[PDB]
């Protein structure tokens, strides 16, 4: 297997200046003609000319219009086209080819493929070489002139990058369109779409230059009524880049296109952003609430790439986080401003500290800029994206908004139209840091370790107060555990946003303060601190670290009730839960190991329960935040704290803690469930797709969270409420009614009812499948077999496969059945999927990422299945490389 090393970067011996493509789509094949106007670079040393080209059928190849002959002048091995250097010109030349490719049977959804009746491309990272020969790397920038031809009845809409400059008829019921895109771009940003697409459109006028931009959003005809919210989101995105960053769109048109079959969420091809339909299409009748934030996030994300990724692009793939971490950070600033709810930032943190912290303590751990890769398709990770976003966000924390904006504009102005590296961004931030510090000797050299060092730092505290001196100190330590990437870890530049709360009145005792920890440890002292404070640490989750606050539960309760920062309140709650979970987990574990006939469990802190009640009953308090405090931390967060985790014992532990709290609070829960109904389910704007109320959706999240708690608890006559909830027009409610009915004999009645409501909308049916998959059912394996036989069948649609299986893998008690039957089932699905879509097969490996954190019997069971998958003779490169890394082989 070929390993690419970051330190080996070298510019090409060649230049491609112009690409002229003709893509002729036929019933049984697509013919691609390409002329590359090329040159010899200053780095050339007389080497063979080697093109990437994967799976291409050669009809002919030529140099300067002279046909080349196989064997004597070139070799092709289905991966690389090698033209021997004696036949390579020494000055500007034309290379041309004609190849045949087959989108109809391209089920891996990379290169050119057919999704239902739409022909569509996906070229990031190295998929352009599946369409035609190229030197397929992002530093090979070129001009593109693209003609697409197709049957006019099947494919009346033709799109590619740039301006449409010709449209023409062709004999035999065909037509063509020509698109000329003169600005340089890397080939991963090429796209083409052909199909019977329907659209909504609008005109946007830019803020400063007053340019008219045409906005088009496209889907298949059946779903064209689900396009409105995306178009609104795109308008909002454009305005936010204008307003926060002073950046306008530069092109006359931007197209968004939904397709049914997509490996990920969406892709930022220049002027032609292509989406998984689940991340573009919604309507209030046919979508759950989460779709609205998802579409806002993903439309924004792709729009913000037009600067961070498209106008400023990557020198090489090791710089991926430079465009992805920075664009996720832009999208989170945008979504925080649009939603105006504290749960937006909390949801990001909740995902990071579960999914990304698990990755970073697994055998897969990597820094946000890895040193090597084998599969690019395996490189697009939550580390690169979400820890990258937190690294890009720490610059804003460190600089403050004014100097952050100054530094960001330096980045953009200096690198616009060019490739760039992570150092170029750090350089820009450093210029702003010198300005903020009024010190031309200040530097951010240490900050570069965030790009190279893997692992999650642990930050811990000790406190001291001298009442006579009115002097308070915070002593802080950082540690990252050694791992396979660095034997010796270095201290990082860690910004610690802090407040000091006066415990008598809840007020702030100091102004906004960001401690800059740059050493393994430091002591920060504060004078004129009139009373011993409770420290409010890492406000807004100011660094991506494990926080050990060394506070008592009394102190954490005070912060939970009275602190100003949503994250520290949420975290203090989290930390109270964790202390309880670890304690009860140990008590259950000992009882199990020692085969005890009786034993004691430590009860939940009663003052903590009283604090939850106080917050729930506060009508001025936020409904989204409330839904977080009545929820235990995610299992994937908890597992980072326990070695040899016995998932049964954790399930018993969570059950005990929820029952303890419900035995005190269920009447409060029920009262709130009923009082929230009027606002939460208000239908005033149900037929207005432009009108989206994130607070209202958070009220529904709270009701649905409470209903789940009350259902599990078998609260008296709660089934009455469940049955009424099933009649709500909102899919979030009526799908909730299905999952909470799992505890009642009405489950299959609601299963049928909600299936009939879901089956005629492709995306809604996928949401129904997820609901079934995640249902807390003792018969879940028989249910999954019924989904397979009756609904999923042999679909190759990644959304269908992910919907049926991934939610079930989060079923702690059943997925981890001690027989290993759940591991066996998901391994079978992975191997089956790997035959046609290696990228999605590796996504389906997700539950195995924590294998070496489980109890020794479950470790053995998971390892056995991974070794079985590794022994499949036909295993893909992707899946083999991933499982070899995951199993430390």
Ligand X SMILES: CC(C)(C)CC(=O)N[C@@H](C(=O)NO)c1ccc(-c2cc(F)c(F)c(F)c2)cc1
Binding residues for Zn(2+) are 301, 305, 324
- The mark string for 241-280 relative to ligand X (x by CB under 6 A, - otherwise) is ----------------------xxxxxx------------
Candidates 372-380, 396-404, 563-571, 624-632: pick the segment binding ligand X (CB under 6 A).
Answer: 372-380
Nearest Cα residue to 563 out of 498, 624, 506: 506
239 touches Mg ion (CB under 5 A): yes
Q: How far apart are CA 335 and CA 763, in angstroms?
A: 23
Residue 110, contacted partner among Zn ion, ligand X, Mg ion, none, CB below 5-8 A by kind: ligand X
Of residues 392 and 680, the one with the C-beta less far from ligand X? 392
324 touches ligand X (CB under 6 A): yes
Q: How many residues bind Mg ion (CB under 5 A)?
A: 6
Query: How many CB atoms neighbour CB 255 within 10 A?
Result: 23
Nearest Cα residue to 375 out of 887, 830, 889, 884: 884
Residue 267, contacted partner among Zn ion, ligand X, Mg ion, none, CB below 5-8 A by kind: ligand X
- Closest contact distance (angstroms) between CB of 307 and Zn ion is 12
Say whether 520 is catalytic: no
Of residues 266 and 537, the one with the C-beta less far from ligand X? 266
Which is catalytic among the residues 98, 232, 248, 302?
302
- Closest contact distance (angstroms) between CB of 304 and Zn ion is 8
645 touches ligand X (CB under 6 A): no
Contact (CB, 8 A) for 871 and 294? no
Of residues 225 and 471, the one with the C-beta less far from Mg ion? 471
Annotated binding site: 124, 265-266, 268, 301, 305, 324
Residue 32 is encoded by which pair of tokens? 């691609």
Residue 397, contacted partner among ligand X, Mg ion, Zn ion, none, CB below 5-8 A by kind: none
CA dihedral 601, 603, 604, 607 (to 10 degrees): -160
- Closest contact distance (angstroms) between CB of 454 and ligand X is 21
Nearest Cα residue to 885 out of 859, 855, 852, 836: 852
298 touches ligand X (CB under 6 A): yes
Of residues 328 and 500, the one with the C-beta less far from ligand X? 328
CA dihedral 853, 858, 859, 864 (to 10 degrees): -150
305 touches ligand X (CB under 6 A): yes
- Closest contact distance (angstroms) between CB of 839 and ligand X is 5
- Closest contact distance (angstroms) between CB of 422 and ligand X is 17
Cis peptide leading into 125, omega within 30 of 0? yes
Candidates 296-304, 361-369, 427-435, 459-467: pick the segment binding ligand X (CB under 6 A).
Answer: 296-304
841 touches ligand X (CB under 6 A): no
Contact (CB, 8 A) for 329 and 392? yes
Nearest Cα residue to 317 out of 422, 418, 452: 422
Q: How many residues bind Zn ion (CB under 5 A)?
A: 2
Nearest Cα residue to 302 out of 339, 245, 264: 264
Q: Which helix H or strand E contains 183, and what residues bound it? A: strand 174-185
Between the alpha carbon of residue 135 and those of residues 11, 111, 160, 374, 804, the distances in Å are 11, 15, 20, 18, 39
59 touches Mg ion (CB under 5 A): no
Whose tokens are 């401003």? That residue is: 337
863 touches ligand X (CB under 6 A): no
- Closest contact distance (angstroms) between CB of 394 and Mg ion is 18
Nearest Cα residue to 273 out of 285, 283, 282, 264: 264
Of residues 68 and 234, the one with the C-beta less far from ligand X? 234
Candidates 155-163, 280-288, 294-302, 432-440: pick the segment binding Mg ion (CB under 5 A).
Answer: 294-302
Of residues 300 and 807, the one with the C-beta less far from ligand X? 300
Annotated binding site for a peptide: 124, 265-266, 268
Number of residue whose CB is nearest ligand X: 265
- The mark string for 434-473 relative to Mg ion (x by CB under 5 A, - otherwise) is ------------------------------x------x-x
Q: How close are the terminal C-alpha atoms of the chain, in Å?
A: 14
297 touches Mg ion (CB under 5 A): yes
Q: How far apart are CA 155 and CA 22, in angstroms?
A: 16
528 touches Mg ion (CB under 5 A): no
Between the alpha carbon of residue 157 and those of residues 117, 118, 203, 274, 293, the distances in Å are 12, 10, 20, 15, 29
Q: Which helix H or strand E contains 828, and what residues bound it? A: helix 821-834
Nearest Cα residue to 430 out of 401, 406, 460: 406
- Return the half-sphere exposure (C-beta side, CA atoms, 13 A cut-off) of residue 360: 29
Contact (CB, 8 A) for 700 and 733? yes
Residues 467-486 that bind Mg ion (CB under 5 A): 471, 473
Contact (CB, 8 A) for 140 and 122? no
For residues 292-324, b (16+ Cβ closer than 10 Å) or e, as one string?
bbbbbbbbbbbbbbbbbbbbbbbbbbbbbbbbb
376 touches ligand X (CB under 6 A): yes
Select the residue interacting with ligand X from 110, 269, 584, 758 (CB under 6 A).
110
Q: How far apart are CA 601 and CA 180, in angstroms?
A: 71
- Identify the sign of the CA torsion 883, 382, 357, 768: negative
Of residues 279 and 571, the one with the C-beta less far from Zn ion? 279
Q: How far apart are CA 523 and CA 476, in angstroms?
A: 6
289 touches ligand X (CB under 6 A): no
Candidates 76-84, 235-243, 314-322, 349-357: pick the segment binding Mg ion (CB under 5 A).
Answer: 235-243
Residues 662-721 that bind ligand X (CB under 6 A): none
Residues 303-332 that bind Zn ion (CB under 5 A): 324, 327
- Closest contact distance (angstroms) between CB of 316 and ligand X is 14
Positions in the binding site for ligand X (CB under 6 A):
110, 122, 124-125, 127, 263-268, 298, 301-302, 305, 324, 376-377, 380, 839
Positions in the binding site for Zn ion (CB under 5 A):
324, 327
Catalytic residues: 302
Positions in the binding site for Mg ion (CB under 5 A):
55, 239, 297, 464, 471, 473
């Amino acid at each position: 297997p070929k390993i690419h090393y970051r330190k080996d970067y070298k510019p090409s011996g060649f230049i491609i200046n112009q690409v002229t493509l003709n893509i002729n789509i036929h019933d049984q094949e697509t013919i691609v003609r390409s002329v590359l106007d090329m040159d010899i670079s200053k780095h050339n040393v007389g080497e063979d000319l080697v093109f990437d080209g994967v799976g291409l059928k050669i009809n002919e190849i030529s140099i300067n219009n002279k046909k080349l002959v196989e064997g004597e002048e070139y070799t092709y091995d289905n991966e690389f086209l090698t033209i021997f250097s004696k036949f390579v010109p020494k000055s500007k030349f034309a290379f041309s080819s004609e190849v045949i490719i087959h989108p109809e049977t391209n089920y891996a959804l990379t290169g050119l493929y057919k999704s239902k009746n739409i022909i569509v491309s996906q070229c990031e990272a190295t998929g352009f070489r599946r369409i035609t020969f190229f030197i397929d790397r992002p530093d090979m920038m070129a001009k593109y002139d693209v003609t697409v031809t197709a049957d006019k009845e099947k494919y009346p809409v033709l799109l590619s990058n740039g301006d449409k400059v010709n449209e023409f008829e062709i004999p035999g019921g065909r037509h063509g369109a020509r698109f000329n895109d003169p600005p340089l771009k890397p080939c991963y940003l090429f796209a083409v779409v052909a199909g019977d697409l329907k659209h909504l459109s609008a005109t946007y006028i830019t803020k400063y230059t007053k340019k008219k931009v045409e906005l088009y959003v496209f889907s298949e005809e059946k779903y064209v009524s689900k396009l409105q919210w995306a178009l609104e989101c795109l308008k909002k995105s454009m305005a936010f880049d204008e307003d926060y960053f002073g950046l306008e769109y530069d092109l006359s048109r931007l197209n968004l296109v939904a397709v049914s079959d997509f490996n990920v969420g969406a892709m930022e091809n220049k002027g032609l952003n292509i989406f998984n339909a689940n991340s573009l299409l919604a309507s209030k009748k046919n979508s759950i609430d989460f779709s609205y934030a998802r579409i806002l996030t993903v439309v924004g994300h792709e729009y913000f790439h037009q600067y961070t990724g498209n106008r400023v692009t990557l020198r090489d793939w090791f710089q991926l986080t430079l465009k992805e971490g920075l664009t996720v950070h832009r999208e989170n600033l945008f979504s925080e401003e649009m939603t105006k709810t504290v749960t937006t930032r909390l949801s990001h943190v909740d995902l990071l500290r579960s999914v990304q912290f698990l990755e970073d303590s697994s055998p897969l751990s990597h820094p946000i800029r890895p040193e090597s890769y084998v599969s690019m398709e395996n490189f697009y990770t939550t580390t690169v994206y979400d820890k990258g976003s937190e690294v890009m966000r720490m610059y804003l924390t460190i600089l403050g908004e004014e100097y952050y904006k100054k530094g960001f504009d330096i980045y953009i102005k200096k690198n616009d139209g060019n490739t760039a590296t992570c150092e170029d961004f750090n350089y820009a931030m450093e210029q702003a840091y010198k300005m903020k510090k009024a010190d031309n000797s200040a530097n951010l050299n240490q900050y570069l370790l965030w790009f190279s060092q893997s692992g999650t730092p642990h930050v811990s505290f000790k406190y001291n107060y001298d009442a006579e001196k009115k002097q308070y100190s915070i002593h802080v330590n950082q540690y990252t555990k050694p791992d396979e990437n660095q034997k010796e870890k270095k201290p990082l530049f860690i910004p610690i946003s802090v407040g000091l709360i006066n415990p008598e009145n809840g007020k702030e005792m100091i102004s906004q303060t960001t401690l800059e920890l740059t050493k393994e440890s430091d002591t920060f002292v504060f004078n004129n601190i009139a009373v011993k404070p409770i420290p409010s640490l890492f406000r807004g989750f100011s660094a991506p670290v494990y926080i050990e606050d060394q506070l008592t539960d009394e102190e954490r309760i005070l912060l939970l009730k009275y602190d100003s920062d949503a994250f520290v309140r949420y975290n203090s709650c989290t930390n109270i839960y964790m202390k309880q979970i670890l304690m009860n987990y140990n008590e259950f574990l000992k009882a199990k190991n020692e085969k005890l006939e009786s034993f004691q469990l430590t009860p939940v802190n009663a003052q903590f329960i009283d604090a939850i009640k106080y917050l729930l009953e506060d009508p001025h308090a936020d409904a989204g935040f409330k839904s977080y405090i009545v929820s235990l931390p995610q299992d994937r967060y908890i597992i980072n704290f326990v070695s040899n985790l016995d998932t049964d014992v954790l399930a018993d532990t969570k059950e005990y803690i929820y029952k303890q709290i419900g035995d005190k609070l269920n009447d409060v829960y029920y009262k709130m469930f009923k009082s929230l109904e009027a606002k939460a389910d208000d239908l005033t704007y149900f037929n207005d797709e432009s009108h989206v109320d994130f607070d209202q959706m958070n009220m529904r999240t709270l009701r649905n969270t409470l209903l789940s708690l009350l259902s599990k608890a078998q609260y008296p006559n709660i089934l009455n409420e469940i049955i009424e909830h099933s009649k709500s027009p909102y899919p979030s409610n009526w799908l909730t009614s299905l999952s909470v009915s799992a505890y009642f004999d009405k489950y299959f009645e609601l299963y049928d009812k909600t299936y009939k409501l879901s089956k005629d909308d492709e995306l809604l049916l996928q949401e129904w499948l997820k609901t079934v998959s995640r249902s807390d059912r003792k018969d879940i394996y028989e249910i999954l077999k019924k989904l397979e036989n009756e609904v999923l069948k042999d679909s190759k649609n990644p959304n269908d496969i992910r919907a049926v299986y991934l939610p079930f893998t989060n079923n702690l008690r059943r997925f981890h059945d001690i027989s290993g039957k759940g591991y066996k089932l998901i391994a079978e699905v992975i191997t089956k999927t790997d035959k046609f879509n290696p990228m999605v097969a590796t996504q389906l490996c997700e539950p195995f990422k924590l294998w070496n954190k489980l109890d020794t019997k479950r470790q053995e069971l998971m390892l056995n299945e991974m070794n079985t998958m590794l022994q499949e003779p036909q295993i893909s490169n992707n899946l083999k490389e991933y499982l070899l890394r995951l199993t430390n082989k």
